[PDB]
Amino acid sequence: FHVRVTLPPRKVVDRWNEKRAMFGVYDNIGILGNFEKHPKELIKGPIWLRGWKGNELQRCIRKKRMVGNRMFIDDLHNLNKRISYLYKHFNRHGKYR
Amino acid sequence: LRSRVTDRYWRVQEVLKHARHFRGRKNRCYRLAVRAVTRAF
């Protein structure tokens, strides 16, 4: 439980930088832009996670379906094992059934 | 997001402040202090 004996350097973070000032600018691109583009394609991230949300099993299945042929050998084997374990746990285990 | 408890010193001290006058290892060891403070209360 030994806590540190010196005060840390206080992080002087500014609330008015470029990212915090321009955060969420075009979230209403469809609403105020005569609907041409959805807020889906503003999402910067993975190929399989753009405009999609699910639990861990559906996430792993979607990853194996989109970028499954581009994953690594060990990552593909680990994802197959995770898919099998999540399938077994989600179907054959639980309380509420 | 890894979260850890930082005030654990104060967590053990809120128990150990009621057990300073005990005999044995109950005034120092936290495992033995909690059972001694509970029976005392």
Binding site: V3, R4, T6, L7, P8 | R4
Partner: peptide, 26 residues
């Protein structure tokens, strides 16, 4: 290393208490 300012400030208060207990002020 643990991220936090509250633990550091709360230990500084205890350090001030220990210093006042060790060397009493005039």
């Amino acid at each position: 290393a643990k991220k936090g300012f509250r633990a550091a400030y709360r230990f500084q208060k205890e350090l001030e208490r220990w210093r006042l207990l060790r060397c009493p002020p005039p």
